[PDB]
Amino acid sequence: YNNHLYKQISNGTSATNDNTYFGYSTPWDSEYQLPYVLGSAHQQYGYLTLNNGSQAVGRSSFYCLEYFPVPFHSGPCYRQQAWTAGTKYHLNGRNSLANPGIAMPSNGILITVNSQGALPGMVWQNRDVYGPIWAKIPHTDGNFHPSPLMGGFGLKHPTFNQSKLN
Amino acid sequence: GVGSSSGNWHCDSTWLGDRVITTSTRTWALPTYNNHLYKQISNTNDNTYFGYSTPWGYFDFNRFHCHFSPRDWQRLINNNWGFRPKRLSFKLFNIQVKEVTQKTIANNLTSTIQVFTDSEYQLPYVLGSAHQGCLPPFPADVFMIPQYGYLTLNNGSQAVGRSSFYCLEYFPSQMLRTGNNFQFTYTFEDVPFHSSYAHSQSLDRLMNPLIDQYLYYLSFSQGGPNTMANQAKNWLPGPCYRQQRVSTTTGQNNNSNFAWTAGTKYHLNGRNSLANPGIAMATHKDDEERFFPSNGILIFGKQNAARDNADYSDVMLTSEEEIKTTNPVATEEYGIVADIGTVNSQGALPGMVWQNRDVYLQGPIWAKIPHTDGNFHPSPLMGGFGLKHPPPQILIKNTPVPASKLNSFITQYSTGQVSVEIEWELQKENSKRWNPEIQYTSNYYKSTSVDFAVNTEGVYSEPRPIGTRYLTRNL
Amino acid sequence: WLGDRVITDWQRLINNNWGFRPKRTFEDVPFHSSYAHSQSLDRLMNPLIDQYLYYLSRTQTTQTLGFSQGGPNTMANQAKNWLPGPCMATHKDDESEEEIKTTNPVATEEYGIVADNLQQQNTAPQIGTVNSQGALPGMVWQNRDVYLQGPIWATDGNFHPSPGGFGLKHPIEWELQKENSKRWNPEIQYTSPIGTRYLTRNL
Amino acid sequence: WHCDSTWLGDRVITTSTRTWAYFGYSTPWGYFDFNRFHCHFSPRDWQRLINNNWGFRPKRLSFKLFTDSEYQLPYVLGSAHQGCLPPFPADVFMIPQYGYLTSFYCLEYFPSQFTYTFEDVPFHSSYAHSQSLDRLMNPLIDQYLYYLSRTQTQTLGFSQGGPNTMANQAKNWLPGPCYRQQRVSTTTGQNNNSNFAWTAGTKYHNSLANPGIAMATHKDDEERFFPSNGILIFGKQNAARDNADYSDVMLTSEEEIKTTNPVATEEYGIVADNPQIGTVNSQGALPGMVWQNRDVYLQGPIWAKIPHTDGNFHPSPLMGGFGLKHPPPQILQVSVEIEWELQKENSKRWNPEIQYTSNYYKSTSVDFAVNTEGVYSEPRPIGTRYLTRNL
Amino acid sequence: STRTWALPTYNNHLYKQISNGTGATNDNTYFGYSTPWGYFDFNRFHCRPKRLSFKLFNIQVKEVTQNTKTIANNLTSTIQVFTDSEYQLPYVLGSAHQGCLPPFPADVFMIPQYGYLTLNNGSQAVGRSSFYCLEYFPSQMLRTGNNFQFTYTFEDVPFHSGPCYRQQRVSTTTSNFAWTAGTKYHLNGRNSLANPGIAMFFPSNGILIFGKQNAARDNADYSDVMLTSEETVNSQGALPGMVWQNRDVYLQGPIWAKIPHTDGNFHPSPLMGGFGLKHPPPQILIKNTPVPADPPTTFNQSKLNSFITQYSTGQVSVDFAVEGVYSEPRPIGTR
Amino acid sequence: HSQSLDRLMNPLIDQYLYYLSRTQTTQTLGFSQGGPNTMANQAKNWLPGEYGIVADNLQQQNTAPQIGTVNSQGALPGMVWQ
Amino acid sequence: FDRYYHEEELESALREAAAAGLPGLARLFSIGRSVEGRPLWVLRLTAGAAGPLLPGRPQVKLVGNMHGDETVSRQVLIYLARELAAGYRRGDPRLVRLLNTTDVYLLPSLNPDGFERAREGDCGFASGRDNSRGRDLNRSFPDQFALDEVPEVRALIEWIRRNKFVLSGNLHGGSVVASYPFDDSPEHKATGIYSKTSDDEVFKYLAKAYASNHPIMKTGEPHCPGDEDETFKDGITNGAHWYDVEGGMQDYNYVWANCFEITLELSCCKYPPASQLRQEWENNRESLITLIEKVHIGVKGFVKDSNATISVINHNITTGRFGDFYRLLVPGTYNLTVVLTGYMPLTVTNVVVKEGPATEVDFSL
């Protein structure tokens, strides 16, 4: 992959703001020190990091992989209804489609009050599995019912020349 | 012994392995409050209260600078993923009790002071409200003990049947003369580590940017590197309680006084109260540093800053931008749902994750979790550690010495030394990140005075609020 | 009545205990809070000491940016650590689950006000009254009171599984929680639907 | 393939694996070199080391794939040559050819993993003094020692050294030795309009004294000025072999030692010619002098073999590093694992110190990372002296 | 050697930034901090070494009031004393400063105030500048019934018994060339006088000059001072083969100095004479514990500004005769 | 010694350290890597025990950089002798 | 011509410009020395230390490169000197009458030390902003609302007090805008506060005259990094209305002297590369000349017997050693009162200023 190179990949407006990204494509982890890309339901290892447009910030991290040696599976509302009318959330000025979203539609399945959060004494079921098996619960201070919205199990720990040879 | 010191000055910080023991000694002066009397106090409908002001003083060390020096804070935040208090030892020694008369001051050897700790939490917990009177950030500073006073249920400026009156003299308290010392050790309960890190990945960018998804979305198409806002995602951003956006560039704001009328507040007991700082949310999106939530941030005060109507130059705003990877922006909506509609205040939903508010060198350390039937993420909104049994309030009073109950007393105050020694546990930073991290550093260029140091007039000032999230982790 | 246990009266239970829970074999259920808070969530501060934290208080001198310290007078503007329960008290003052008005918002009226639009020089700020508020971090609440005539007890995920009554995963001796309060003035007792919140606690 | 850094106590064990392929002689042998610091330390690890330590030194290394354990061969390492292990582990490097200057040394005459133990070496000063050598006194108390302050009303007057006449106070120490270097401005227009790179260069008789003894690059507010050949100049990514533009190179700055060492472009001081005054440009060792060594860099050499001579004065390499009488032997997939003993700082300074941090503001590419075409680049030479001490 | 000492309240218990930029030429520019602490100095010989024992006892802490200057014992007041045995503070000892223990035992001396200097760019500090709060150290507190004591062991320093740096020729038998023609060294663009420089009718600044009793602080006449005597190429560094002697120690001169913690040094013997020590006797810092006056009856967040004017006396343990004024007629060398 | 102090390098491998090789094009700043051909300009670690050439003045746009011959030189760090 | 002249170069370029005109026209002198001893070169241009003061010729100064890294001002002032001399030799009628009727002072670099510490390509999005003593030259003048640490400021103050400057403008960098005086406010708020003068409209007119001829400033939108699209109407702005500056030099010039000064932010890249300098010249040349011509507006004249104070507007001005006075005003009627201590005053009313040349009046006290 990548001819044994780490290639910096990115995308900015010069696509759209919601699709901008920055990351690295590697030519390829028991302590979970790499960006965990599993659980995103993908069909080469590459990861993303913080970006502001097509360019990264100082808080962005670069990982060189050569630098390496639950409850049994079986109601809150976030109303669903293609993109303009789709149910999406907002994070850092970047509208991301809430597909499939909370378990219960334009983007609500796997292929008056309209948004109700958690209340005392209310019960709900999790999305069924068909499909992904697990997902890594993000290492974060707080999470409410850390179950994968896509379904599955929420796992906390799931002649010499100086130039490099081409 | 009147002629022998009760204790010694202990200001130090020992960094042993994953433990940091920060001990700090300060000089305190306690006057006679309310002239040895319990006085009922009472007071727009939003600001009404009823309560009692007690002749008792209380010791406050709920601010981080009371224990961590700026270099200590830098050492803590530059190398550790998290930290939490493990224990504390509190000592109160070298007590002098002096009488002032009309004017001269003389030692009163036989006089005592009453000191106790509300270890059973039977008193109203006034710590954790981010009040003044804490131990000074600078050890050489001598500080005045704040007066203890508590609030109760009120109907306007009048009490109700359930109003509780607490006589602090009803508690068992140790009496100390000039030769006696007080001390107690308290052990913090199991508390989650404060996240002294900023996520190096955003929540909506946790996928592989090289491989398409096997899940289709209504476009039908498969989520891919190009159309990544449409990819299936396992988690949602944290809950949002939308705040009003105020620009530090004062010319970009509306020409109206919207601080209270258009501020974000919560309604309780028919009495609107400003949701300050509210739930933890990003101060602003990227390239938007001039904007802050109207009341959704911690605003500390520079040295000599005015109590009321202090200009922007006299205050320091704290920014929660480093949690923009997970927390939705405070000033901007949570998202769009169908009816389309814009959701501004979003409660908790399954699968959402959110970072807590940052702690600061000048900010609070802990707060008592209210003894309630239920609570969702019982973490203080101003930051710190939520404790069911926090460090007990240390109440101190000058025992009255009389000169119908006796009214005239000898005008008497006390001084002494107070030591608080807190042992904290650290999370060692174990990351395979290749590029150098972002560290907190002092400005290299020449400066008229050293930051976090005394000026020419002997005044210690903190120039900026030092955050805690500088190292990085992955989601 | 033997120590912290009672084997089965209601007046004696509610006038002398902070909580109670059935034992038998009932699973460990949290003690039902049989107490009304003597402090309100917005009044947990010291009414004598100002706050070192500042808040935005001033915007017109033209346009300005003024900050003030929370104090006894500007008490509603003070920074607070907690939020009321999700939107639950029956009624506010001078208007039954009123014991929880200290922590729970009034049922017949809104949770609060959020910001609606994004202000600029040309757009006045807009406010949105939130009627249905879900769970938020740091928000606290009380449960509905039990009554002598009321019920005792009653999925993949649930949030705060409390009915009123006891939330039992697997649904008589009652273990009591003796009140240990140094409140000076006499407490409120039941004297001749009987509630359960008569004794008082601090928040 | 072992490549990681383990921080245990006051030790850091950094292992790295890489994929590999005048008169004198050029041998067919290729020699393994890992004498640059980035061969062992990642930029994150270098930041971690330099932000939290007052010093470090190698303890022992293990090298797995002959070696001249008795140093019978011309030790060619320590001359800052290419062929080192690449800073980026994913890079594949070619073994440099081994050649020496003069004595014929036939390498197959020697019999063809191993472990080497570093001899006890002084810790490298990974700190910059917070005090100046001429400002070690009490700024509140006068001196009881008098100094000649007046000579004509013709007379003889003596004064006590005090806070105001601070430069006249008696002192116990002198700055380090000086070997004056020609000054060149990075602002090109401020320089002379002549090619004085070689003619006006500071050289010893005529090999060029590059970088010479450890002296401060510039005094205060003169970051544009640098000694003509008295500093280490590293190459930015894809820099020219020769005739490189100033923007194509990165100049190191040694001003951290300006508090103890004389400025490289300025004189050591003034002596008496006879009342004529003479200016000393080159100053040898004098009693009571103290001086800091040249800073080591993430790209700089780690060690150098002390020549086996009858005598030497402060045998620390002039390019920076650890002067070793018996350095790691020349080695004629590769894993090198080196252990460093850290010197933990115990500072009671109140204000926060200066740490190495990456710029927060947006950048097109992450610094110390790979670009779009997969080329790893070191954007700046990371020093080692960031924490502060007292003299 | 036991002396009676008095310590006043320095700087009103305030750490004060001090600076001096450009009179006051660039060579005299400094930045630093004056602390409310005094320090004990016994670095003069009249106050090789193997060990010392330091004691600080018989402490009286007296409060003074003005109306009528009335001084009264404050039996409940303490003093904080600590030794930076880890050498974490700027070591201002060894700079030949005043405030040392008097040569005459009967003299009662004033404890000099502790201040330190730091990196400066004129009267203006830099990022590398360090601020040290002496209250950030574990200091033992002492009332009238308490005594302080420690012991220190000198390391193996060579017994007290040529490179050249030419000085200017000055005759005691009388233009103003003291600074212009003097022998100085250049450091960070700051010409600092090389006094007394390396060990070599006296050189311009290459000797130690002591002051007789009742001598002017500045422009003291030659009869009011005592010169010490240690009886082309102008600067000659160390060469292989030269041997030289160190500057002699004197009954009034310094005993030791701290060898700066530096990568390298050549013959680390103090230029003033004495013993170069990597770990010299730790400087002993002593301060009156601040005793606030009566604070108001209403809480104020600001630090207390009114303190009781206070001081503390005590005893300290560790020709040529006296209107009761003790004087040393001449400097006594060792060789 | 079978080697001289200024010939302890590789006559085959270039250096990764640059030295100021050009100043005048007008004025400029050219840097070159020390190599076998330009072996005198190459960086070293040691100095000999006319000792050498130092700079006397501080060159400006007009002041030519006059040099000075060191006839007597004292001990310096990284200096070896037999 | 694309080259940043440094120390020595400055003097050489200024004297080359002086020789680029007729002899007896230009005089290059020094009003003082910087901290490092670099002279503060000032070029005086007029037909005929600084030499005697010519009658009927108002004194105009243009102090540039007052911040070290704001160096477009330095080069445009050098090019202004060269252009003035070249036009005077070539017989440029506009420049001929300008030099005949105006005593133009040019100060290319007030902070040469900061300019030397400045680095090429640094647009300022320290970099030598302060002098070598670390003090800001714009935060060191006495604020209307220590001299030893700023010898450049003291030298400028003495030069101003020794003269009777009528019109001036200091040229800056980091934006493209003309800001008129009262650069601060009594409340000393960061921004927003409008702080007008007694001659607020006259300062507005001067800023308009400079800005309208500038290709970038006339648009009223600098449109530069880190500006938040801070659109300045008409290309002009007020001091405190833009941002607070305590102790600005233009405020001292207005209050402590007869000077009318406006700060000119020529470009938002503080230290542009040499190649762009040519363009910068064409961006400013005319405007600079225009500003000098604007000294000939309002009222001018002499006060003679049959230091006199001229009063109109709470801003009085004094006469020169020749008794000449120049009050910058716009068209309209004004009531000019002349008052000299010991000379009973004269209130000449209905003085009508027409657009363009200043109105003339001679007073006999």
UniProtKB/Swiss-Prot annotation, chain G:
Tissue: Highly expressed in placenta, pancreas and hepatoma cells. Lower levels found in skeletal muscle, heart and colon carcinoma and melanoma cell lines.
Origin: domain of life: Eukaryota
Subcellular location: Cell membrane
Chain sites annotated for binding Zn(2+) 1: 67, 70, 172
MF terms (GO), sorted A to Z: metallocarboxypeptidase activity; serine-type carboxypeptidase activity; zinc ion binding
Lipid biosynthesis found in the keyword field: no
Chain positions with Phosphotyrosine modification: 180
Predominant place of localization: membrane
Positions of glycan attachment: 100, 138, 307, 316, 335
Region Disordered: start-end pairs: 118-147
GO biological process: peptide metabolic process; protein processing
Residues with PTM Phosphoserine: 185
Motif (Cell attachment site): 90-92
GO cellular component, one term: plasma membrane
Keywords for this protein: Carboxypeptidase, Cell membrane, Glycoprotein, Hydrolase, Lipoprotein, Membrane, Metal-binding, Metalloprotease, Palmitate, Phosphoprotein, Protease, Repeat, Signal, Transmembrane, Transmembrane helix, Zinc
Residue ranges constituting the Peptidase M14 domain according to the UniProt record: 3-295
Active site per database record: 265
Family designation: Belongs to the peptidase M14 family.
Domain notes: There are 3 carboxypeptidase-like domains. Only the first two domains seem to have kept a catalytic activity.
Protein name, UniProt field: Carboxypeptidase D
Gene from which the chain derives: CPD
Residues of the full protein shown: 55 to 459 of 1380
